[PDB]
Nucleic acid binder design. Structure first.
Length: 74
RNA sequence: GGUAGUAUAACAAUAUCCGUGUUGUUAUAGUACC
């Protein structure tokens, strides 16, 4: 691997989750290394992911919440 | 003076459950590095 394929994580979440909420935590830093932690809320379970910039944060959250809440989609 | 990052905004392409995302190009600004 190298160029990865996070598009998979995004779409996969969308599939399992036709409607949910994304919310941001942290997001502060020196000036050029901002830490963003975006957490996704599904069915009352909230999973948090930390990325530099907005990209990876929500992404990683999607991955987590996927493996997680698929055990309780209702 | 030059180099760089982050953020906001616009356009296009790509994928798409049309909701959204990824990618590419451009513009503006504090700061950081030399």
């Amino acid at each position: 691997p190298g160029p990865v394929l996070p598009k998979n994580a995004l779409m996969q979440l969308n599939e399992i989750k036709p409607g949910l909420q994304y919310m941001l935590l942290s997001q502060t830093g020196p000036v050029h290394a901002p830490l963003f932690v975006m957490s996704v809320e599904v069915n009352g379970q909230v999973f948090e992911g930390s990325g530099p910039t907005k990209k990876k944060a929500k992404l990683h959250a999607a991955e987590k919440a996927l493996r997680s809440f698929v055990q309780f989609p209702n």
